[PDB]
């Protein structure tokens, strides 16, 4: 059994600067996870997939880059729209399958 | 020699015939025997739950012997109280077959430890009967061996 | 030692709801633990039990569509009944016996009504 | 089978006055009985159990003795909160077990 | 593709409810098609999964009072549920999975709240 | 004869509903009984039957979610149901059978709508 | 299997004229069938049954006869109260028994 975690929980982010988001996966992991991205209220959406995939319809401004146990994502423009929750996950065997771990918040 | 000598109320048997029990060979013939109310004899039997077969004496299912039961209102009730006799009330869980418990320790009722001195929360496992003359058939004493 | 108890409202008949006892003080796998109805206006009536070990007795208007159920875990008692319109139209109490015939903890009811 | 009932039923007791109630068993009883006290719309509390053992939190003004078929309980002082309901049991065999009868009802 | 998902509301402890999840555009008996589940102010989780073929597997704490079923004649797939206190108080999404991993089609959630 | 119908109400998809057919005037335990269906602003629809001998007979559209059954102690008929959106949306009727073809004691209708 | 069909559906008669109902029965038909009245938002009463029988309570103003196939209801008098809905049935085999078919309306 794996178990998914992310560090930054919590953060305060400005317009004018970025942000970087780090989830770690213990014993290992392959190159199959997921970023979502659910405003509050609102059912979440596919943000990146795989490895650094990106999606239709997911701007350029988007880009999640990692390998192996360390995995992260950053977003490169000003956050117009400041955006708020996001989340990891990663298919395991027949117990538990889909393992989603602890959120993150972003504001300003 | 059974039925000469004592009438019966609840002459019983498993697995084993009452006519045909003569000639027949066995190596071991135990016998138990105590005293229980009238209305919990019939807790003496294969399976069943109660306060007495559950927690006091448990028969086992592929029970090959035979229960006698007849009443003793005459002589074992008392002139006005027989609390000599007690029935283990409280249990933490059910006996194995053929089995057996003397202890008189306080029982525990919460997760609070218990003291030696029974009060609150803390009980006398064993309770006492009730036997007098004047009362009804289902609360006269009986024998069972 | 208190034995507060959640669950109610109103259920259509063959429907089903369940009570949950809920006891601190006390052991739930420890104690004589019974059900208590009481119509209104009316007096009170039995309806089941469950011993420390893994026995239970149902009274007979209330045999074959009323389960018991305990859970270590939440320290709780559990009542599941599939209800009628006769059957069930009562306050449901939770009781603790101490000398093998009283019931002295006796929790606040829960109305339960069909319609 | 046993059937408990009680003989008083209603009853009108002033202040001054005591109050004594008595209820019956069919075929005979044991020496355990239980009396309960049931204000209108609260949860009936134990009273009297067992052979005139009283109970803490119970006033002494209270005393229920009786031996075998005949069983009453009486109260000596002037009740200045004018009781309500009481009721009795006891417990059975498999198929009945606790059995509570008629109940009771005292006032001003 | 759209998945409008319906039924919801309140239903009493050990009641039970059926979610049904209507999807124009893919076919449920061709997709990995799941149910996830999102308590209020808390992280989602899993609870159910079907395969193309006649596979089903639940996660622990949804396992055997949680039953999922697809009915091909109105492309939909349905969820039975015989709820519990803790077990559903949260808003349920519907989803297809592309590579194995990945759940874009998500739903819009109908709360089931118990009470 | 009257029959007088109970029960009724909103259930929601996947619940359970039972309904009561009280006859004062005529035996259920002696005629031909069945339920009857009408959706709003349509035909009827026959959903049961149940014989004088211990034989019931149901139609396709409601086989292995409706049961039926009587109770000769209180000369009333029952109907249990566990109800699906589309199944169970219209009025219920009770009804006797005079000559093996012809309906004519009619009940009022009780309203059974699913949400 | 038959299938009960209703040629008229809906109709205009006024109160001086009568009106005249058909219902077919495919694959032909024995001699019982019922005729329903059904007054809107009330529970429907027999009106006619089996091979014109007439019904106690039932007015002899109706009248419904007919052998085979074809099977029709008539009304005599000049409807003072306009009727609105009527349905044919006859009971089958096994799988299908009650076959009411479709509904016919009558009005002003």
Known sequence: ?????????????????????????????????????????????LLIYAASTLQSGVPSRFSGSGSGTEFTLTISSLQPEDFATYYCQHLN??????????????DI | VLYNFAPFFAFKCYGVSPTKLNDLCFTNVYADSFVIRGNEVSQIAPGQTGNI???????????????????????????????????????K???????????????????????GVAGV????????????????????????? | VQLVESGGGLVQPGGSLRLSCAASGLTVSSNYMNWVRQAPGKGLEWVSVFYPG??????????????????????????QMNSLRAEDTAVYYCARDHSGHALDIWGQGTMVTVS
Chains 1, 4, 7 share one sequence.
């Open chain 1, 1 to 45: 059994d794996i178990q998914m975690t992310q560090s930054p929980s919590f953060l305060s982010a400005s317009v004018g600067d970025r942000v970087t988001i780090t989830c770690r996966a213990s014993q290992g992991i392959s190159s199959y996870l997921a970023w979502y991205q659910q405003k509050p209220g609102k059912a979440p959406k």
């Open chain 2, 121 to 145: 929360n803390c009980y006398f496992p064993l309770q006492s009967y009730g036997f007098r003359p004047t009362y009804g058939v289902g609360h006269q004493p009986y024998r069972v061996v």
């Open chain 3, 54 to 79: 893994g026995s239970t007795f149902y009274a007979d208007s209330v045999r074959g569509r009323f389960t018991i159920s305990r859970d270590n875990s939440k320290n709780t008692l559990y009542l």
């Open chain 1, 93 to 106: 065997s027949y117990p538990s399958m889909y393992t989603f771990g602890q959120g993150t918040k972003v």
């Open chain 2, 53 to 91: 077969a559950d927690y006091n004496y448990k028969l086992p299912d592929d029970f090959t012997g035979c229960v006698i039961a007849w009443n003793s209102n005459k002589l074992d009730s008392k002139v006005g109280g027989n609390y000599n006799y007690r029935y283990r009330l409280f249990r």
């Open chain 2, 93 to 115: 869980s059910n006996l194995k077959p053929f089995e057996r418990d003397i202890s008189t320790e306080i029982y525990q009722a919460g997760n609070k430890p218990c003291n």
